[PDB]
Design a protein around this ligand. Sequence first.
Ligand SMILES: [Ca+2]
Ligand SMILES: [Ca+2]
Length: 665
Amino acid sequence: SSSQGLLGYYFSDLNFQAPMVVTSSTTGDLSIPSSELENIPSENQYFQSAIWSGFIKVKKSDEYTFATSADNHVTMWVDDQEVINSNKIRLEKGRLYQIKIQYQRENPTEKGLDFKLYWTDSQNKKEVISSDNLQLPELKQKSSVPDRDNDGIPDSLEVEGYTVDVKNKRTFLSPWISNIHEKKGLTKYKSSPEKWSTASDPYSDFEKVTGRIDKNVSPEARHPLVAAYPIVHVDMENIILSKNETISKNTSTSRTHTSEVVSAGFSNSNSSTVAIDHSLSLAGGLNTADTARLNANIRYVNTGTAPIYNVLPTTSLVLGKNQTLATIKAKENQLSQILAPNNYYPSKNLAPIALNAQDDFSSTPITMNYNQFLELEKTKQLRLDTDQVYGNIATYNFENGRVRVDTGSNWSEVLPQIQETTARIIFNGKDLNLVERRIAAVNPSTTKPDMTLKEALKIAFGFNEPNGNLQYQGKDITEFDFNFDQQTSQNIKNQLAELNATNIYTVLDKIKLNAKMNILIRDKRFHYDRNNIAVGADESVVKEAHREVINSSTEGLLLNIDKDIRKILSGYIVEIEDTEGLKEVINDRYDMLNISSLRQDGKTFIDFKKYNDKLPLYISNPNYKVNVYAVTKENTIINPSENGDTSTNGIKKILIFSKKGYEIG
Ligand SMILES: [Ca+2]
Ligand SMILES: [Ca+2]
């Protein structure tokens, strides 16, 4: 508990107008050595005034006399009862007494401040007040030292710009100073002087930048304009079907975002889609009055910016458009760990959660009638709808200076405000998964910081401009498309008009965000479905992606393929073409295309043996060709056609390799 003591404001001017340093002292020693004033301009290092605030707490009732290093330039009050300008004052045990210390000094010939706070009890024991008796003011939001929102940062600094510099034992909040601060690698902040939390979340602007916050809040959300909140969906890893009173397959799940009509949506609901493996795992009985049972392994996923402690959200497992087959619930207050941002529950190094645990004989079975099982087979897809019922928030406590789960703070009270006051940006550049972030933005309809689209991209997703050109990890911003909801689209379209700009990438630094916008940014190389899941890529892109052939034989192809490309590929078709042009498909079945696998070295191996009776391809003549085709997710057939055809005939495939027997060797 290091944020113990009084909160001090140090001004360079004589009448509390130019805040230079805002920081806390641990004990009665309120001194700031010039040694730690490096980032402050030489002249402003001469503090002409200062104000301290907090509370005093005594373990045993008694009468005290307060004094300071310079009683002549000070005015202190205890409970608004003026003590210095100095008589004894009684303080009962178990009571917090508010302190306010004022200090003015016109003639600083010295830099920094040497100023201590003392007190003497009834016996004549005089000593600098200990950390044990001091505590910061309750800088929490108010019911319905210029600090309109009570977060602790002066209104002027929030509006003008400020930064924080961690000294050896303290963190100094200071106004932004370009020449000094920029080249020191410090971040310039600007927050609303009217909002305790500028992004409307449970942590204040001061708590965020000063580090008086949950260790699990994402680094980017420690910025007062970036919202810190959980975002959870369920990830099904595998499933097993059985006849009620066996089909065991791997599943791929993707968090989703539904577009309307082409145009991103307004939904702030969680949901994921599961695709069950359609390929043979082994090889290969139900009637109209049987029932099948479903079990599966799952993990909760937090892709947001704040953790969860005592309530996992509820989820509906859905078949088709709206046939709920189960309601998945976790036990409130019985979590075995927290669900951290950019993390899982349970953690990936631990076993996943079974819907019906081997343990639990009393778990509700997930049942399907005969028609349902047919529907599931027909689609081989499931949906997981999850509510936004998170629990209590681990908040910072000024009394003890520790972060703890607060039973009085609840996410449900927070989410609506965050959603109404910020701009949403969903970006998939990291690994093609949809990642959502919310940035504080003004309701067009004079307090909040203006926010440009470029800056949002920088503080929320970590984009940068090494030469003034915005990029996300070496990838130019033009490699990503911008999609908006209808309203936002017209808004942006209008902004362009006033700028006489016809292109967005050209004026990103000048497009301003407003609260309630919905912006979707996706990698341009891929095909997306209505859920915004990457389901394909142009033939040209795919062909190009298979150019790096490290090896080829009658046994298989070894290649280097982009991780994002491999994600949109469902399978490969192997074929031998004779000198006549006639073909022979080796793995001639819609469920036998699962011949690719990633190696430890990250190289892809396409296995010719798998579906060739574990024997290497037999190329009767070296003038014969081996063609290998790639099938993408969106073109994947998962059942026999409607007659009964199970061949690869009719499958939209992309030629990605073709060489003669002698070229392959
Ligand atoms: Ca403030
Ligand atoms: Ca504020």
